[PDB]
Ligand binder design. Structure first.
Ligand SMILES: *[C@@H]1O[C@H](CO)[C@@H](O[C@@H]2O[C@H](CO)[C@@H](O)[C@H](O)[C@H]2NC(C)=O)[C@H](O)[C@H]1NC(C)=O
Ligand SMILES: *[C@@H]1O[C@H](CO)[C@@H](O[C@@H]2O[C@H](CO)[C@@H](O)[C@H](O)[C@H]2NC(C)=O)[C@H](O)[C@H]1NC(C)=O
Ligand SMILES: *[C@@H]1O[C@H](CO)[C@@H](O[C@@H]2O[C@H](CO)[C@@H](O)[C@H](O)[C@H]2NC(C)=O)[C@H](O)[C@H]1NC(C)=O
Ligand SMILES: *[C@@H]1O[C@H](CO)[C@@H](O[C@@H]2O[C@H](CO)[C@@H](O)[C@H](O)[C@H]2NC(C)=O)[C@H](O)[C@H]1NC(C)=O
Ligand SMILES: *[C@@H]1O[C@H](CO)[C@@H](O)[C@H](O)[C@H]1NC(C)=O
Lengths: 49, 50, 96, 106
């Protein structure tokens, strides 16, 4: 609905705030995976025997 | 596709060891935030003004 | 149809940056560095050491002399293998 | 916890709304291959290193500290005795020096 979005524009930057917070959470999850698992920059291999 | 890192096959055997013959004194930085900006809000002046 | 109902109303799920195989490759690198080199790869270059001698270092780290390990190496290896098998059985047999 | 490597010491520095730690750590470097053994068999006795590790450059057996190559003669002062040579897997035959032996040999 176009007029609903026009009325939503009068509420200000609420949607921008929610999108920014969720983007911060989304990059925070990837950062969490980097801190836990990406602790070595060398990919070590087990010997074949 | 992003590279995880350089492959490094460690030369493992059951009777070989690697002993360091030298060292590096390495200084690194760790930056940690401690405090924020302390803010106060006059609620009546913000909502209503005068 | 929950996922389609979420998606149709604007709620999308972004994939993780690292796939499951890349996280598994990170854990395989951590396993290979730990088994082949001990704690040395976490503090610099990976220095190879035999695993009985690494585990003897770890016994010396907990206040037990190395000869306790070297005289009981088969027993310690068997206890470790049985414990790993018990981890696999206990994880497969417990829902919680 | 205090930098990459074996931690030696650290320095604080103030920063706007924060702290910056300068972590001084020890990083091993210029490693070298050696042939190692868990124990030394001497006179029917098994000798284990008191603080180090047995290494060999190809011909001679030494005991060194683990994080820095400093080879020393395998003596009774830096090794301890536990049991015979029949139990340890990978024990090698080498002599173990006794400082009392040249004193009583003369
Ligand atoms: C210790 O010896 C091993 C071989 O026994 C060396 O490992 C080789 O290193 C070269 C150069 O990087 C590689 O091309 C080979 O593939 C490695 N072989 C194996 C089986 O991994 C090792 O580099 C030596 N250590 C030092 C410090 O020189
Ligand atoms: C240990 O490493 C240091 C450097 O990390 C070496 O010192 C260098 O030695 C070369 C040749 O003697 C000089 O050209 C450099 O100027 C030195 N650098 C510094 C910072 O002093 C040292 O020789 C190494 N020691 C061993 C036994 O390998
Ligand atoms: C391993 O180290 C030992 C001691 O550092 C070496 O023994 C000496 O080698 C030199 C050079 O050949 C001789 O002049 C000395 O007489 C040796 N000392 C003794 C007590 O015999 C040994 O050569 C080294 N081995 C290798 C393969 O480098
Ligand atoms: C270390 O020395 C011992 C004895 O000093 C060696 O054990 C002997 O090995 C021979 C060959 O297998 C046997 O015939 C003898 O009966 C063994 N004697 C004893 C008391 O066990 C041993 O082989 C040597 N190790 C190495 C690697 O040379
Ligand atoms: C080390 O392994 C090799 C081959 O894998 C074997 O021939 C040798 O006997 C082993 N030595 C010890 C002490 O286990």
């Amino acid at each position: 609905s176009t007029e609903c979005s026009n009325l939503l524009l009068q509420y200000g930057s609420f949607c921008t705030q929610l999108k920014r917070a969720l983007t911060g959470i989304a990059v925070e999850q990837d950062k969490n995976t980097q801190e836990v698992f990406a602790q070595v920059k060398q990919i070590y291999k087990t010997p074949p025997i | 596709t992003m590279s995880l890192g350089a492959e490094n096959s460690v030369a493992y055997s059951n009777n070989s060891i690697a002993i360091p013959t030298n060292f590096t004194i390495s200084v690194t930085t760790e930056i940690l935030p401690v405090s924020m900006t302390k803010t106060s809000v006059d609620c009546t002046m913000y909502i209503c003004g005068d | 149809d929950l996922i389609c109902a979420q998606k149709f109303n604007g709620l999308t799920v972004l994939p993780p940056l690292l796939t499951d195989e890349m996280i598994a490759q990170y854990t395989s690198a951590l396993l290979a560095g730990t088994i082949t080199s001990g704690w040395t790869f976490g503090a610099g270059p990976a220095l190879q050491i035999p695993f009985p001698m690494q585990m003897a270092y770890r016994f010396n780290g907990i206040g037990v002399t190395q000869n306790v390990l070297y005289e009981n190496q088969k027993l310690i290896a068997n206890q470790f293998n049985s414990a790993i098998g018990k981890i696999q059985d206990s994880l497969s047999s417990t829902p919680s | 916890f205090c930098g990459k490597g074996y931690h030696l010491m650290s320095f604080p520095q103030s920063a706007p709304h924060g702290v910056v730690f300068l972590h001084v750590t020890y990083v091993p470097a210029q490693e070298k291959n050696f042939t190692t053994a868990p124990a030394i068999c001497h006179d029917g006795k098994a000798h284990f290193p008191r603080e180090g590790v047995f290494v060999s450059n190809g011909t001679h057996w030494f005991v060194t500290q683990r994080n820095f190559y400093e080879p020393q003669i395998i003596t009774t002062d830096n090794t301890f005795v536990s049991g015979n040579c029949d139990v340890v897997i990978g024990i090698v035959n080498n002599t173990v020096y006794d400082p009392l032996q040249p004193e009583l040999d003369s």
